[PDB]
Design a protein around this motif. Structure first.
Motif, PDB file in Angstrom:
ATOM      1  N   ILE A 206       0.853  -1.195   0.000  1.00 20.87           N
ATOM      2  CA  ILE A 206       0.000   0.000   0.000  1.00 20.87           C
ATOM      3  C   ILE A 206       0.895   1.254   0.000  1.00 20.87           C
ATOM      4  CG2 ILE A 206      -1.891   1.258   1.160  1.00 20.87           C
ATOM      5  CD1 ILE A 206      -2.273  -1.767   2.538  1.00 20.87           C
ATOM      6  N   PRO A 207       1.046   1.915  -1.176  1.00 16.36           N
ATOM      7  CA  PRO A 207       1.805   3.167  -1.229  1.00 16.36           C
ATOM      8  C   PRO A 207       1.004   4.330  -0.639  1.00 16.36           C
ATOM      9  CG  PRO A 207       1.696   2.081  -3.392  1.00 16.36           C
ATOM     10  CD  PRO A 207       0.623   1.502  -2.527  1.00 16.36           C
ATOM     11  N   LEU A 226       0.463   3.600   9.903  1.00 14.12           N
ATOM     12  CA  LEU A 226       0.043   2.298  10.437  1.00 14.12           C
ATOM     13  C   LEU A 226      -1.261   1.779   9.828  1.00 14.12           C
ATOM     14  CD1 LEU A 226      -1.413   2.612  14.046  1.00 14.12           C
ATOM     15  CD2 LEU A 226      -0.200   4.578  13.105  1.00 14.12           C
ATOM     16  N   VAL A 227      -1.262   0.486   9.499  1.00 17.52           N
ATOM     17  CA  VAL A 227      -2.447  -0.230   9.009  1.00 17.52           C
ATOM     18  C   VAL A 227      -3.231  -0.731  10.226  1.00 17.52           C
ATOM     19  CG1 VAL A 227      -3.340  -1.994   7.414  1.00 17.52           C
ATOM     20  CG2 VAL A 227      -1.096  -0.997   6.983  1.00 17.52           C
ATOM     21  N   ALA A 246       0.358  -3.596  10.196  1.00 18.47           N
ATOM     22  CA  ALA A 246       1.655  -3.199   9.643  1.00 18.47           C
ATOM     23  C   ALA A 246       1.954  -1.741   9.969  1.00 18.47           C
ATOM     24  CB  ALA A 246       1.691  -3.433   8.140  1.00 18.47           C
ATOM     25  N   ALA A 247       3.199  -1.471  10.365  1.00 14.21           N
ATOM     26  CA  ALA A 247       3.638  -0.126  10.749  1.00 14.21           C
ATOM     27  C   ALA A 247       5.057   0.188  10.276  1.00 14.21           C
ATOM     28  CB  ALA A 247       3.518   0.067  12.256  1.00 14.21           C
ATOM     29  N   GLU A 248       5.210   1.371   9.678  1.00 12.91           N
ATOM     30  CA  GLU A 248       6.512   1.934   9.296  1.00 12.91           C
ATOM     31  C   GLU A 248       6.588   3.426   9.631  1.00 12.91           C
ATOM     32  OE1 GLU A 248       9.610   0.546   7.231  1.00 12.91           O
ATOM     33  OE2 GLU A 248       8.847  -0.830   8.760  1.00 12.91           O
ATOM     34  N   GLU A 249       7.802   3.899   9.911  1.00 12.11           N
ATOM     35  CA  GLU A 249       8.068   5.326  10.146  1.00 12.11           C
ATOM     36  C   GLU A 249       9.266   5.837   9.340  1.00 12.11           C
ATOM     37  OE1 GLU A 249       9.477   6.357  14.293  1.00 12.11           O
ATOM     38  OE2 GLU A 249       9.274   4.202  14.648  1.00 12.11           O
ATOM     39  N   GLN A 314      -8.267   0.525   7.776  1.00 13.71           N
ATOM     40  CA  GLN A 314      -7.923   1.951   7.664  1.00 13.71           C
ATOM     41  C   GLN A 314      -6.420   2.215   7.798  1.00 13.71           C
ATOM     42  OE1 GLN A 314     -10.753   3.184  10.929  1.00 13.71           O
ATOM     43  NE2 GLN A 314      -8.897   3.865  11.997  1.00 13.71           N
ATOM     44  N   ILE A 315      -5.934   3.172   7.007  1.00 18.45           N
ATOM     45  CA  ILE A 315      -4.582   3.725   7.142  1.00 18.45           C
ATOM     46  C   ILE A 315      -4.652   4.915   8.103  1.00 18.45           C
ATOM     47  CG2 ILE A 315      -2.694   4.968   5.906  1.00 18.45           C
ATOM     48  CD1 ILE A 315      -2.745   1.894   5.154  1.00 18.45           C
ATOM     49  N   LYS A 316      -3.859   4.840   9.173  1.00 22.33           N
ATOM     50  CA  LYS A 316      -3.698   5.946  10.117  1.00 22.33           C
ATOM     51  C   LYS A 316      -2.288   6.531  10.040  1.00 22.33           C
ATOM     52  CE  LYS A 316      -5.149   7.335  14.751  1.00 22.33           C
ATOM     53  NZ  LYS A 316      -5.661   6.883  16.074  1.00 22.33           N
ATOM     54  N   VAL A 317      -2.225   7.857   9.917  1.00 19.42           N
ATOM     55  CA  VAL A 317      -0.967   8.606   9.991  1.00 19.42           C
ATOM     56  C   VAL A 317      -0.913   9.471  11.261  1.00 19.42           C
ATOM     57  CG1 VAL A 317      -1.704  10.410   8.316  1.00 19.42           C
ATOM     58  CG2 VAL A 317       0.748  10.004   8.714  1.00 19.42           C
TER      59      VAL A 317
END
Lengths: 346, 340
Positions: A206-207, A226-227, A246-249, A314-317
């Motif tokens: 997911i870009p 984060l997903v 899934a989570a990236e920073e 949901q995508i959370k930023v």
């Protein structure tokens, strides 16, 4: 797809089905079409029924202690199939071929789904939980009734799945923009979130293109994407709980009076999300390897509330900004944008 | 549409067409079918070609004078004279015109590829006295000895799109926000009546907002946004508001409101405004706002020209505990002419 059978213990009733999975489209659900083969000597002077059951199950199997098993039927429906009274109605190509192949003792059944039903969803147990099980599953049971007064020997049961696939046409490009204001500052902090598409597949990245334009003296310490899996359990009361999948920073921090437009790709996988309690998964046929639960699509404007396990994504930023009392103390600003994680159309 | 002609200045080539508008159905574009009447005395020893051209154009006249930019996005040509052998497949229009006019008529068919834009022009400002910009299509038949200008004849055509038979899903957009101090959310959901709307047709925008924050939503504002994509050497974007409506109701803390506002995007309310995308003209007639461009999926080449899309923007003004916060989400739709 491929014809499969199951014979009862006394060999009185044989059940035939063409497919395990039955696709729930928004408008209509794919009906359970099949036939039963009976031995006429064994079923002489008794009624045969074919039933469809949707159950909320809880298993618990403790070693040395106990074995507690809980069940709640969300749906139960049955049609009589023997003895035949007149001719049968409209039959599928599968039913017509199977009656033609097997013989005269073959009788068709059609069991339909209503609009208010969930899909085959199971919940993941922790390594703390040895015998614990939770999920919604679908069952077809064919049983005879010798009414000279239900035998277990005459009854034969078979597990099926209510599945949903990704729609023909994709939804809108899911995007949101926000402009936040602080304690006394005239200048705003602007955030824009965008995904490449509305629907993603299992295993597909997911870009998440994120565009923060910081014009304040405030420093953005880290940006985190984060997903989130929104799991809804409906039975007596509606219960929502959220888990991160899934989570990236980003490595880069956003300076005061400076902007950043960065795209971050996130892959949600069960392989990364094992060992965690309450993670929603797509329902198994029989002990096979599975994936994370598909997004549930409910029919619009229906009278009755859908019970069971309902799954949303949901995508959370999340943005940690240097808030009140200085650089040492920090506060949060966030944006949630929903999406569908679904299997492709066959 | 009826049959129309244009004659060359030296009366050598006369071009015939059945229609001006050629429909871009997403899978296949309607080809240009016509004939050319020739005079054999004037054309003796000459070669005649009929060409189709797509051109991005810009014009400039009188500030401090003359400047014209052109980029040929497409060019294709077919020979018609002298005839070698026999004609291929002919339309009923071509066969009827060959019979009526006689021996010296020759058919042409010029096809469109998948990567081409539609006839879109741009509206100039009141002060912009000699400025014009747009993508336009041309059919040109000409004699060759070296091409004389007197022997050529040019005729404007349009590439047009109509609304499809099958409509897409009901357009829905959701978004939630968390503010600086409070961990409480603010949820905004938007739904439209249709995926495709007609020119003049009202758009019901149903806005749903659930407040859980300690903050008050002051005003709810809905905009129809025309997104204009100008592709030539690089992809360039600009967004212009066409129709705007705001609701009188405000949303308190720990409250919910569902409101449905109606917006009618019209050129009559958007005249005297620079950069507004318009459907291309034949000759100086009154037009509308440009139709939404539909591009064929999974094509190899990039589409150049002016590309038009429409979206519904809803923004909420959220007052604090100096200036108020703004939160917004977007939802696309299609604005098109109906099927003939």
């Amino acid at each position: 797809h491929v014809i499969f059978k199951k014979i009862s213990r006394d060999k009185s009733v044989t059940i035939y089905l063409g497919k395990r999975d039955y696709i729930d489209h928004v408008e209509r659900v794919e009906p359970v079409d099949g036939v039963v083969l009976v031995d006429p000597e064994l079923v002489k002077g008794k009624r045969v029924y074919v039933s469809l059951t949707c159950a909320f199950r809880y298993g618990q199997e403790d070693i040395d202690v106990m074995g507690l098993s809980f069940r709640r039927d969300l749906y139960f429906s049955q049609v009589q199939v023997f003895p035949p009274v007149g001719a049968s109605g409209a039959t599928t190509r599968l039913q017509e071929s199977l009656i033609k192949k097997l013989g005269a003792n073959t009788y068709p059944f059609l069991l339909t789904f209503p609009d208010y039903l969930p899909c085959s969803v199971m919940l993941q147990p922790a390594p703390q939980d040895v015998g614990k099980s939770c999920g919604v599953d679908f069952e077809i049971k064919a049983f005879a009734t010798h009414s000279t007064d239900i035998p277990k020997k005459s009854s034969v049961r078979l597990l099926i799945r209510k599945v949903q696939h990704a729609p023909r046409d994709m939804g809108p490009q899911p995007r949101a923009e926000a402009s936040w204001q602080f304690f006394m500052s005239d200048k705003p902090l602007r955030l824009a979130v965008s995904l490449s598409k509305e629907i993603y597949y299992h295993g597909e990245p997911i870009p998440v293109t994120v565009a923060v334009t910081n014009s304040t003296e405030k420093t953005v310490k880290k940006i985190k994407v984060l997903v989130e899996q929104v799991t809804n359990v409906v039975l007596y009361s509606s219960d929502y709980y959220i888990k991160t999948v899934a989570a990236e920073e980003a490595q880069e921090k956003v300076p005061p009076n400076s902007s950043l437009t960065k795209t971050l790709t996130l892959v949600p996988l069960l392989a990364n999300n094992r060992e965690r309690r309450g993670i929603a998964l797509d329902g198994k046929i029989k002990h096979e390897d599975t994936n994370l639960a598909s997004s549930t699509i409910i029919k619009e404007g229906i009278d009755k509330t859908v019970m069971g396990i309902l799954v949303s994504y949901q995508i959370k930023v999340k943005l940690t900004v240097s808030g009140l009392l200085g650089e040492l103390t920090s506060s949060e600003v966030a944006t949630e944008v929903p999406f569908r994680l679904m299997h492709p159309q066959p």
